[PDB]
Ligand binder design. Structure first.
Ligand SMILES: Cc1cc2nc3c(=O)[nH]c(=O)nc-3n(C[C@H](O)[C@H](O)[C@H](O)COP(=O)(O)OP(=O)(O)OC[C@H]3O[C@@H](n4cnc5c(N)ncnc54)[C@H](O)[C@@H]3O)c2cc1C
Ligand SMILES: Cc1cc2nc3c(=O)[nH]c(=O)nc-3n(C[C@H](O)[C@H](O)[C@H](O)COP(=O)(O)OP(=O)(O)OC[C@H]3O[C@@H](n4cnc5c(N)ncnc54)[C@H](O)[C@@H]3O)c2cc1C
Ligand SMILES: Cc1cc2nc3c(=O)[nH]c(=O)nc-3n(C[C@H](O)[C@H](O)[C@H](O)COP(=O)(O)OP(=O)(O)OC[C@H]3O[C@@H](n4cnc5c(N)ncnc54)[C@H](O)[C@@H]3O)c2cc1C
Ligand SMILES: Cc1cc2nc3c(=O)[nH]c(=O)nc-3n(C[C@H](O)[C@H](O)[C@H](O)COP(=O)(O)OP(=O)(O)OC[C@H]3O[C@@H](n4cnc5c(N)ncnc54)[C@H](O)[C@@H]3O)c2cc1C
Ligand SMILES: O=c1[nH]c(=O)n([C@H]2C[C@H](O)[C@@H](COP(=O)(O)O)O2)cc1Br
Ligand SMILES: O=c1[nH]c(=O)n([C@H]2C[C@H](O)[C@@H](COP(=O)(O)O)O2)cc1Br
Ligand SMILES: O=c1[nH]c(=O)n([C@H]2C[C@H](O)[C@@H](COP(=O)(O)O)O2)cc1Br
Ligand SMILES: O=c1[nH]c(=O)n([C@H]2C[C@H](O)[C@@H](COP(=O)(O)O)O2)cc1Br
Lengths: 235, 229, 235, 234
């Protein structure tokens, strides 16, 4: 028996990110060695960071890291993993038997399907779909996992047996970035009609991106607001 | 549906030669002067053994790759490459699926355990038959979701990781060597890696094409233990 | 016996860069295998490249390379080597006796000096500045080069003798990028009031950038034109 | 003007421990359950050695270390060739340069290299130190004197600096993860015992040594493995 889930989760597992890190790093360029010591307050912090954001001076946002634990279907992990300045370590289906958790969209998700990303007329759907999707998914997931279990039972290599598993199978990974890589990622992986360049990601990676953005907002409140302020363009 | 076991790589564009390496390396010792066969062979052997990899980066190779998604995930972990890949969010995907061929060992059960490696050919028929039921049902349902007006990006959730995809993949020679050290199983190498056979097929095809472009670099690569400089 | 020059030179030595490669790379997404054997006409090329440029879809612009031979002052080479997606190989002063060639800015250049980059009110300059710079530079360079040779004559290692040499000493290097990295470089290393983000690079690095742009314009005229139509923002 | 021979590195921030390695590696083999349970020094060391010996590099990337570095420009150029790092450096286009310049100390000059990579080109002596100090003093004094005359003439900071030598001190922040740091140590330390002998100049190697010490304090199991296996980055 399989488990169907529709939750996509991100947990902040570790970090070293602050708005002060950014101020210090940027100060060294005009201040020299005073940089590491100086008297910088609430209003000077806002001012400097907004300025770096508006000028796209991005390197001072690199002196940090945030590490997330992500649990998501493989098709969404494929989206996250396209971001080449991040580091990733993922559960391996060559090394382990895969758990029978599979992703299905929730009812309320399906009313926001993008038939051809970037085109307005292709957004829509309604919730007779959800039952049809649940019904199709259940049949395909069951068979795949049963054939999966069957080959493992004959002693077929796990890396071969998994060929039958759907891209909706859940995976778990660690994902580490600095703030600049995170802002570049948010620019592409959130849909924000406010933004200078509006992106059209699938909703499931956007779910990942929003949770990450919430955790990041707490660590770097001033950077986060400035990022939104300047049109969600990565410095 | 179609079942297939080809995994193909074609070189589609390049600007890559051994001489491009020699010139790049020679600005250092010679300056402007830098812009035979034995000084080329010599210089390249030295850069390889000293691990001066920067001269090997002044070049590009582009490949067109046809492989199932699980192997494409392997390829796309190499972050210094450039990729563009067929999208199931935009396209209705083709009913082509990978199954291993007859000569594939079917029993590495934990890679790096050359105690967990083996196989037979009654395993073959089992794999094919069993994958076939999985793929058939997945595709039928993928079609029924499309036919009900479900968006492509959602319909595809039911497709296995053995679905064929296709992409352009571009690297310089230094990134390729790094890729080859990880993505071929070569007990003769200084550091032995244990890649899945399917990505290794990709890798062998790329190495073969690259040997035609840069045969002296390819020889030095192997001579010094298949360690990327 | 020193030589003063004020020419910063870029030569394209090799490339494999075209607009058509960009189209193929984008078409694989929507057309699959067929993209590799498709024929593309002028208007479909233009429409597609302008679409990617304005949408900031940048990956299709990476399947190429350009290799430049660059001769420039150290201080300008440092600007150029800040760009981490490039490949560089540079003449070594640890290995080679350095040539007596040093950069001075020419008279036209000095009219457009940047006192506080980004601040337009420290932009400017006089006509007699050229003579004061030349008289000042020539004295300092002569002494550095003379001490350099003295150190070399006393058997001091080249790696140590060169500490007396100025940031205006000429170096030579190969610099290799793809068009996307070149574009991000041009958005930062050229000053353009038309641009969506006006940058304030030292004129010396900008001279490097303009010549790269000219050579690249010839290889990928469609992309070039599109990059400029949409405000010099790197996809 | 002030002549110095110190090259300093200070750790100003980090999030790095051997623990972030074990967790990142454990996800692959034990899934979700690798964030959340049984941890053991022996098994932690055996896993880190195994990743190191096998060059499984990626689990060593979930961390960061930020160094504040003060070093002459010619050394900064060596450090900044490592493109996986992030840097922010004092700008001479924005700032009047301080007249601090590097001269090698007396012991260092006894080493000097070549031609780097040839054993028989290493040498020096202690009236050579006084040559170096005297030539340097003459060059730097004139450079700084011209620098000032140009600034006094209202010539722009960015142009005036053309006269200053590559021995001018600069200050920067440098952030990397432990995988990038290992690669940098492999190339920027000279260790006849390593699987690959590298021949960096002494000054960047003085930067490297201090970074290694600071890192080893944070990740001693990783550092012991790095060294045990020939100082090859995973
Ligand atoms: C047998 C095998 C098993 C594997 N097992 C797993 C697994 O179980 N789970 C999993 O997630 N992955 C696994 N991987 C994938 C692996 O962790 C890498 O993602 C992939 O192999 C490519 O690694 P790479 O970074 O060395 O090369 P690429 O990312 O091209 O990077 C090339 C080199 O670039 C440098 N580099 C680039 N970016 C950085 C950076 N940000 N920091 C430091 N250095 C950088 C490094 O020196 C690196 O060696 C496995 C790979 C193999 C061959
Ligand atoms: C709506 C949407 C649609 C997409 N469509 C497709 C698709 O149809 N097909 C497909 O294959 N992918 C697609 N992608 C993925 C896309 O092609 C990117 O690889 C992904 O968005 C990550 O972007 P990136 O390459 O800008 O950033 P990452 O690879 O981190 O790189 C980040 C930034 O680093 C720089 N950079 C890193 N490496 C290089 C390099 N080698 N050269 C130059 N600059 C570099 C660039 O400035 C880049 O913007 C899509 C993404 C979105 C949000
Ligand atoms: C003794 C010595 C002598 C040297 N001689 C010279 C010289 O004469 N001239 C000169 O210019 N430099 C010289 N260098 C500098 C050298 O060429 C490198 O720029 C510097 O050593 C940083 O090394 P790196 O590129 O391997 O690592 P970093 O750039 O962190 O890169 C780490 C790893 O990332 C990967 N990587 C990152 N970007 C790319 C990319 N675009 N393509 C492929 N892989 C990538 C590679 O796998 C690389 O090894 C020398 C260095 C040493 C230690
Ligand atoms: C007018 C001007 C003023 C400047 N002022 C200063 C100054 O005062 N002090 C100073 O030190 N420098 C200064 N710089 C240099 C600047 O900080 C950058 O190093 C330089 O512009 C290189 O471009 P880049 O860092 O945006 O991207 P480059 O390193 O090419 O990289 C391209 C893209 O790759 C991505 N990327 C690559 N590596 C990482 C990583 N490790 N983490 C996250 N993302 C990554 C980013 O998305 C980045 O934009 C200035 C440049 C200009 C034009
Ligand atoms: O040999 C491997 N190659 C590889 O690239 N991975 C990466 C790919 C993917 O992001 C994740 C899991 O892959 P498998 O499910 O193929 O292990 O780790 C893992 C192994 Br083991
Ligand atoms: O929104 C997208 N996000 C994405 O990352 N890709 C990348 C991921 C994968 O390597 C390939 C195809 O993905 P889909 O099958 O998710 O389109 O392109 C494509 C699209 Br469209
Ligand atoms: O040991 C070296 N370290 C180094 O980083 N380079 C790089 C730095 C610079 O960009 C160029 C030449 O510097 P020297 O002039 O410092 O060799 O090559 C060269 C040598 Br040799
Ligand atoms: O316009 C700039 N371009 C640049 O690349 N830098 C980087 C390069 C160098 O590493 C450091 C100091 O450069 P000047 O010394 O040119 O400011 O910051 C700074 C400025 Br401002």
């Amino acid at each position: 028996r399989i488990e169907l889930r529709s939750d996509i989760t991100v947990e902040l597992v570790d970090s070293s990110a602050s708005d002060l890190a950014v101020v210090k790093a940027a100060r060294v360029s005009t201040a020299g060695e005073d940089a590491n010591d100086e008297l910088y307050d609430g209003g000077s912090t806002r001012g400097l960071i907004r300025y770096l954001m508006r000028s796209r001076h991005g390197s001072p946002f690199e002196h940090n890291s945030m590490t997330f634990l992500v649990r998501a279907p493989i098709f969404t992990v494929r989206h996250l993993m396209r971001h080449r300045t991040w580091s990733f370590n993922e559960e391996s289906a060559r090394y382990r038997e895969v758990g029978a958790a599979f992703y299905v969209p929730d009812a309320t998700r399906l009313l926001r399907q993008e038939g051809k990303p970037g085109d307005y007329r292709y957004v829509g759907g309604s919730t007779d779909d959800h039952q049809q999707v649940v019904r199709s998914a259940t049949r395909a997931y069951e068979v795949a996992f049963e054939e999966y279990q069957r080959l493992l039972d004959s002693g077929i290599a796990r890396e071969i047996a998994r060929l039958v598993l759907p891209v909706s199978t859940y995976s778990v990974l660690y994902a580490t970035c600095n703030a600049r890589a995170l802002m570049h990622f948010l620019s592409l992986r959130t849909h924000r009609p406010d933004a200078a360049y509006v992106s059209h990601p699938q909703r499931e990676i956007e779910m990942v991106a929003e949770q990450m953005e919430t955790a990041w907002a707490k660590l770097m409140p001033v950077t986060h607001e400035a990022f939104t302020a300047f049109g969600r363009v990565s410095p």
